[PDB]
């Protein structure tokens, strides 16, 4: 598979009045690791982050083209983009290449501007939006991630309780995948802060 060439996994969880977005940091060509600090999560505007998983070249391309569109959109209609609007924008971009698509499964997570309501979603390669209420996973080890989030996620967790759940889910999901890991970066988006910490993972 083309998606399993560079590895990586992104995860987004929902809390009471907060969101969390975690991702692996290993960048590697097939079985060989190159760097251990590849960026898979990009800031789309204060309380809006986008995590990309899949082909590393398409992860950077899609992140750069979405930023290009996001900059023009925010300048045109001078306002902060809304989480749901970004998903439609990203889905539209991915659907332009319907027969020569980008190999990347995006995972959007952020708080709605002004209302501060949590929002998480995931899209497929051809831009198929899927808004959920609990969590969204994307990567080469989604099965492992699906099993962790299903039995760990709680309806209304707080910033600290949410951070522990998304970290335990990622740490145990990337330990079962060979081409995923080498560090885990977690971003917890609140109403007035953006805590970012790197978890102590296995360097295997």
């Amino acid at each position: 598979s083309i998606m399993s060439y560079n590895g990586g996994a992104v995860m987004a969880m929902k809390g009471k009045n907060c969101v969390a977005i975690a991702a692996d940091r290993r960048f590697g060509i097939q079985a060989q690791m190159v760097t251990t600090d590849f960026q898979k999560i990009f800031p789309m505007g204060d309380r809006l982050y986008i995590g990309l998983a899949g082909l590393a070249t398409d992860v950077q391309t899609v992140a750069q083209r979405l930023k290009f569109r996001l900059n023009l959109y925010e300048l045109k209609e001078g306002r902060q983009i809304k989480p749901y609007t970004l998903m439609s924008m990203v889905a539209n971009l991915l659907y332009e290449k319907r027969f020569g698509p980008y190999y990347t499964e995006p995972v959007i997570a952020g708080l709605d501007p002004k209302t501060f309501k949590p929002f998480i979603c995931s899209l497929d390669l051809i831009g198929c939006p899927m808004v959920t209420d609990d969590f969204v996973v994307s990567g080469t080890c989604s099965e492992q991630m699906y099993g962790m989030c299903e039995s760990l996620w709680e309806p209304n967790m707080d910033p600290e309780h949410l951070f522990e759940t998304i970290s335990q889910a990622m740490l145990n999901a990337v330990d079962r995948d060979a081409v995923s890991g080498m560090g885990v970066i977690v971003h917890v988006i609140e109403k007035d802060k953006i805590t970012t910490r790197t978890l102590k993972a296995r360097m295997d």
Binding site: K76, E77, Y84, T85, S88, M89, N92
Partner: protein
């Protein structure tokens, strides 16, 4: 084939006469009045064919661009049909990408761009119509005015067409910030009554209102009662 040179050029004094002549065509057309009032916006126009053979229910001056945006004009009738079609396609295009009703300000800007393209393109003349767009988004009313040159202004209450200067004075000393939609219509029709020559009926004017529920074109019944 088609000409590829600009029909509208700068004069020695620095004026674009073609646009200036198009504004003179807009200043002779049926009067239009736009009023933004707290909970909504109202757009009224003198839809009088004055002949008694024309079907009053057939043609329409006040058109809905989208579910929350209405349009009204002053100037040439056929030119307005082109702009209304362009404004409807621009609203659909925007909604196909962002999956959310195009904001009133975003539509005006997009529609004003089209009007500015006919003042610099080859083998064409500027649109001879001034639009009065109105919309409602993000719990707030909007009222814009896009003239033939392509420039747009945000107003609170305005009037175009015949006797527009006279209506702007009668509107500047009769309009209040804290005004309700229902009362906004009363002062919108009263401003149109100051240059209506004959007798005003329910089939001589057309009124469209905008609010939280979305743009609506008042039916004859409603207007009758208001009159």
């Amino acid at each position: 084939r088609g000409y590829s040179f600009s029909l509208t050029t700068f004069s020695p004094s620095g004026k674009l006469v073609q646009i200036e002549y198009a504004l003179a065509a807009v200043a002779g057309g049926a009067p239009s009045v736009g009023i933004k009032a707290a909970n909504g916006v109202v757009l009224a126009t003198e839809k009088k064919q004055k002949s008694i053979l024309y079907d009053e229910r057939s043609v329409h001056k006040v058109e809905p661009i989208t579910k929350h945006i209405g349009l009204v004009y002053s100037g040439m009738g056929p030119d307005y049909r082109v702009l209304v079609h362009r404004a409807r396609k621009l609203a659909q295009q925007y909604y196909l990408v962002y999956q959310e009703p195009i904001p009133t300000a975003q539509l005006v800007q997009r529609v004003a761009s089209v009007m500015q393209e006919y003042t610099q393109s080859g083998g064409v003349r500027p649109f001879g119509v001034s639009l009065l767009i109105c919309g409602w988004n993000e719990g707030r009313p909007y009222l814009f005015q896009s003239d033939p040159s392509g420039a747009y202004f945000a107003w609170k209450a305005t009037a175009m067409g015949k006797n527009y200067v006279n209506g702007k004075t009668f509107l500047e000393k009769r309009y209040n910030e804290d005004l309700e939609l229902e009362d906004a219509i009363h002062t919108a029709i009263l401003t149109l009554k100051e240059s209506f020559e004959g007798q005003m009926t329910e089939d001589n004017i057309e009124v469209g209102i905008c609010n939280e529920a979305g743009f609506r074109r008042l039916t004859p019944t409603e207007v009758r009662d208001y009159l």
